[PDB]
Enzyme design. Structure first.
Site, PDB file in Angstrom:
ATOM      1  N   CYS A  70      -9.045  -6.853   7.828  1.00 30.11           N
ATOM      2  CA  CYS A  70      -7.838  -7.530   7.947  1.00 30.11           C
ATOM      3  C   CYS A  70      -7.023  -7.706   8.938  1.00 30.11           C
ATOM      4  O   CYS A  70      -6.399  -8.776   9.431  1.00 30.11           O
ATOM      5  CB  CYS A  70      -7.075  -8.069   6.576  1.00 30.11           C
ATOM      6  SG  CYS A  70      -8.159  -8.524   5.074  1.00 30.11           S
TER       7      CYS A  70
ATOM      8  N   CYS B 277      -1.804  -5.709  -1.124  1.00 29.16           N
ATOM      9  CA  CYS B 277      -2.790  -5.839  -2.560  1.00 29.16           C
ATOM     10  C   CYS B 277      -2.062  -6.050  -3.658  1.00 29.16           C
ATOM     11  O   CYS B 277      -1.056  -5.591  -3.952  1.00 29.16           O
ATOM     12  CB  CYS B 277      -3.412  -4.591  -2.497  1.00 29.16           C
ATOM     13  SG  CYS B 277      -4.458  -3.998  -4.011  1.00 29.16           S
TER      14      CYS B 277
END
Ligand code: NAP
Ligand code: NAP
Ligand code: JBO
Ligand code: JBO
Lengths: 206, 206
Positions: free
Chosen positions: B188, B109
């Site tokens: 993911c 992130c």
């Protein structure tokens, strides 16, 4: 004022490698000082002269600067998080050799932190910035024709040649491609408008 | 499950806690790296393994990454907007650990600001963004199977699993819930369609 022979310090670095490649394709006769030859790619653009040595050893530096028209300094110590003097001691070895061999032009890369408020430096980057300031002093006080290149974040975008150079300030963007950075390093060999200035290169990419 | 052992970095943080909770609920065998002063809450879900240490210590990152199938990176600075390199340096350590231990998949992130016009980054967020930019470049050039997760504002709205994932651009809303953000980090792990891409999760909560 034609510049044909240049020395590149830091040729195996991120910016150094593409500067060297650009310099060789543009016709420059390039001398590089490397500590390990297997780090120069064995394909395509290769320098005309390789000096195996260390920038802290004045003999190696003198051998590298002998008979050049200008010097390009792309030294870095990416790993050093605590006080470090490698770049500034390297600048001293470069300044001295430039003087003994009559080379008057140096283009040297520090960082845009030298143009922004000191509080902008992250703590773990303060030592390299401190030595960047120390190297900037050595070069500025030397009397030589010295172009200070203070780039922001160095990216991997393709070469454009379209970046802006703001003289003694900070311009539009906060990124310069390593390719564009080395382009500007070599552009500084072809003019005097940046001599004795601090240059900030940046560009809007896509 | 092909992916079953994962390391979460930043599991004590605002997104990391719900990501840890969803990962344990989904049957993952979770290893977390926590700083000594900040352990996971008492009543919270327990991971399968805890490493106490710091992401800035290569040895601790190696302890955390060893034996894992994949890595989720949710590091941050809490509400501290100061210049930092904890995320980029930590990613450097994570990248080295993954290469040493043969882990390829990392979902990390940074921020939507790496997809938007840099001139629009609010100055108060530029320092943290400058490290997201450094961190993304580290992971991009690692060669690993890297999913760049680049969310907009992180909210407290519910877990929906109904968010939009926009590829390599800004999406249709300026918010993602921490719960939905963590859902996507885990989504993911089960697909390779985002590997090498930048991803912008966003949703409208109503
Ligand atoms: N990364 C950024 O975004 C950024 C932004 C602003 C400014 N800068 C600064 O720009 C300068 C160049 O950046 P860069 O990333 O292209 O550098 P780099 O990849 O870290 O390469 C450093 C170069 O200097 C050489 N070097 C280091 N110590 C040496 C020594 N004692 N003797 C001879 N060579 C030595 C290295 O040789 P080896 O291959 O042997 O190590 C290498 O070629 C750096 O000073 C950096 O701090 C970087
Ligand atoms: N609206 C938003 O909040 C927003 C929007 C876009 C992007 N982002 C970015 O998204 C990422 C995650 O956001 P977040 O709010 O979920 O994170 P956070 O609440 O700020 O938590 C940061 C996590 O990273 C850990 N950490 C920090 N330094 C560490 C170190 N040296 N070693 C090991 N762990 C360390 C922290 O552990 P401790 O518990 O010990 O502190 C914490 O668990 C951040 O990078 C953030 O900047 C946020
Ligand atoms: C990354 C870095 C920098 N970076 C910058 N300098 C000026 C302005 C912006 C940045 C940036 O990173 O955005 C400077 C010195 C050394 C180093 C390194 F590689 F050693 F870590
Ligand atoms: C709040 C924040 C952000 N915010 C955003 N990022 C991307 C797009 C929109 C936003 C937004 O909040 O409008 C980014 C990094 C760090 C931080 C934090 F929490 F540390 F302050």
């Amino acid at each position: 004022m034609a510049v044909k022979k240049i020395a590149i310090f830091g040729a195996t670095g991120q910016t150094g490698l593409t500067t060297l490649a650009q310099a060789v394709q543009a016709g420059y006769e390039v001398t590089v000082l490397v500590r390990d030859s297997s780090r120069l790619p064995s394909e395509g653009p290769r320098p005309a002269h390789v000096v195996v040595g260390d920038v802290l050893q004045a003999a190696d530096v003198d051998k590298t600067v002998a008979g050049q028209d200008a010097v390009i300094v792309l030294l870095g110590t990416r790993n050093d998080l605590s006080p470090t003097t490698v770049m500034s001691e390297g600048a001293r070895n470069i300044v001295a050799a430039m003087k003994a061999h009559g080379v008057d032009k140096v283009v040297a890369c520090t960082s845009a932190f030298l143009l922004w408020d000191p509080t902008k430096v992250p703590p773990r980057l303060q030592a390299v910035t401190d030595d960047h300031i120390r190297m900037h002093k050595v070069l500025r006080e030397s009397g030589l024709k010295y172009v200070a290149v203070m780039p922001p974040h160095i990216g991997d975008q393709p070469l454009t040649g379209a970046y802006t150079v703001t003289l003694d300030g900070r311009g539009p963007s906060r990124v310069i491609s390593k390719h564009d950075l080395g382009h500007f390093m070599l552009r500084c060999l072809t003019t005097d408008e940046y001599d004795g200035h601090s240059t900030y290169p940046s560009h809007q990419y896509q």
